[PDB]
Amino acid sequence: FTDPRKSELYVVEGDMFQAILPLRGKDRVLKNTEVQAIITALGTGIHDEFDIGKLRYHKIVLMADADVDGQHISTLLLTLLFRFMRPLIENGHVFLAQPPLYKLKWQRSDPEFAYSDRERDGLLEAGLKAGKKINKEDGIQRYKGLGEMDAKELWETTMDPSVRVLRQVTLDDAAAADELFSILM
Amino acid sequence: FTDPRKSELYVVEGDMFQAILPLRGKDRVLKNTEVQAIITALGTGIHDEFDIGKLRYHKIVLMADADVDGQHISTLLLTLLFRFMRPLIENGHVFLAQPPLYKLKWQRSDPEFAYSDRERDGLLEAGLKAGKKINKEDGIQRYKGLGEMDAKELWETTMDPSVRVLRQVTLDDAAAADELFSILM
């Protein structure tokens, strides 16, 4: 069930087998217990001892808010991977999970989630023109932050491989993270 | 969201913030990357360096099949905790999650799950006598194993703090695990 090439490690930056590990907003970070856990859990070793052979997770999905802070941890973790386990990025293992930004509370249909303003307006338009009703004042929840949503509206919405919205991290993507980290010094 | 006293570490023995880490069926185990990850992730250190102060998870829930193997890993992990991090057990942090054993596929009502034969017969009886219909041949799924069920029928069913069925591990409970491990040698 939890075989290496059939499992994923999610890194929920707070502050199908899917493992979940947290990382909170905080270069001796390699000694932060949460980082060591994420690093240990990947099983590939680090720096010169990096061994793609011992990777235990097919996918490494990073989950945070692209609306808060500056992903100071999504840019902090990314740099860590880039200059300690870069092959994980190069071979396309790293990813970003976009949490839902909206919950359309249809009056009598299972709610729907939109991950972009555009998807909202279209889903609203689709639902309405399709005979679905929705309260005009508190019908559309604007998730400020993440996690503060609801377990299962966090699962069905971001862990569900079908409905989830994933965007792979490219070496270019990781390079910027590294620069921004450097510049934030 | 993921604060130490408000988060849990689930250990899914394969082969509210909830982190998930796997452990597969396999005393130098402390060098097994999955064990080191679980051990690192708890952040308390081990043996003489054990520090309840640095525990990062309020609850440590172990999830496996009480119908397969002999929880050779649930008895292996338990012993590890008992003789390397015993205070985690003593202070009532360890737990066992019982996966559902049955899925009552009601004809037109959200399915129901039973964790014991008794709960099955009663739910069936309740649903029927309540005007709900169910196919007599393939209406009641008998989960052989776990995980092979369905993501969200694994979540809503075992991660959901409301509906989940947890049973705390007592020092007595852990002592047996230790003996059985010893005897299995």
Curated annotation (Swiss-Prot), chains A, B:
- Full-protein interval shown: 448 to 652 of 675
Membership in a protein family: Belongs to the type II topoisomerase GyrB family.
Record function comment:
A type II topoisomerase that negatively supercoils closed circular double-stranded (ds) DNA in an ATP-dependent manner to modulate DNA topology and maintain chromosomes in an underwound state. Negative supercoiling favors strand separation, and DNA replication, transcription, recombination and repair, all of which involve strand separation. Also able to catalyze the interconversion of other topological isomers of dsDNA rings, including catenanes and knotted rings. Type II topoisomerases break and join 2 DNA strands simultaneously in an ATP-dependent manner.
Q: Where in the cell is it found?
A: Cytoplasm
Task: Enumerate the spans annotated as Toprim domain.
Answer: 7-100
Asked if the keyword Cytoplasm belongs to this entry, the reply reads yes
One Gene Ontology molecular-function label: DNA binding
What keywords are annotated for this sequence in UniProt?
Answer: ATP-binding, Cytoplasm, DNA-binding, Isomerase, Magnesium, Metal-binding, Nucleotide-binding, Topoisomerase
Record flagged with keyword DNA-binding? yes
- What would be one Gene Ontology cellular-component term for the protein? cytoplasm
**Underlying gene:** gyrB
Q: List site positions: Interaction with DNA.
A: 26
Q: How does it assemble?
A: Heterotetramer, composed of two GyrA and two GyrB chains. In the heterotetramer, GyrA contains the active site tyrosine that forms a transient covalent intermediate with DNA, while GyrB binds cofactors and catalyzes ATP hydrolysis.
One BP annotation, GO: DNA topological change
Could you say which residues bind Mg(2+) 2 here?
A: 65, 67
Question: Residues that bind Mg(2+) 1, according to the entry?
Answer: 13, 65
Query: What is the protein name given in its UniProt record?
Result: DNA gyrase subunit B
- Any miscellaneous information on file? Few gyrases are as efficient as E.coli at forming negative supercoils. Not all organisms have 2 type II topoisomerases; in organisms with a single type II topoisomerase this enzyme also has to decatenate newly replicated chromosomes.
